[PDB]
Amino acid sequence: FQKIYSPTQLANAMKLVRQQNGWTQSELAKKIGIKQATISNFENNPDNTTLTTFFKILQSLELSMTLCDAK
Amino acid sequence: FQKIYSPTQLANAMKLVRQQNGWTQSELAKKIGIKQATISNFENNPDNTTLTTFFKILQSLELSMTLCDAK
């Protein structure tokens, strides 16, 4: 887990976690009451994705987040 | 820096960093080409805030973020 500085870097990182665990977009979506299309749009077009969607997808991936220095 | 699980927890944490450094919303806003109103709305109503706004405010606070296990 490296430091993340943009929505694109964030989406790429979270997509990788999903793929490394063999999870489909539908699995996660159904687990958190979100559309599959919303996850697809987050992974490919995260710039305008809301924080709510982000944190729900975080939960489905069994992940959390912390702040840190930009170094 | 604790683990964060929601937009509200995120906004509270980042607001605290701003206050601990004596920064005003206008200072940060001008540094990243964002409206002051956008920062105010993020700190008080973060649920629908876009990821772009979030990462821009992150930069102004000289912060970054990492993913981690939800434990």
Add this chain to the structure above:
DNA sequence: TTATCCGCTCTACGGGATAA
């Protein structure tokens, strides 16, 4: 200094759903 307002445009996200 910050919460809050106006009027505008754009898009996310829900509801549907599909191709291959």
Add this chain to the structure above:
DNA sequence: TTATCCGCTCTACGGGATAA
């Protein structure tokens, strides 16, 4: 399986700006 579509409503975020 996932990118992508339709039509809808809501709101964020830019442009203005204010009170105290």
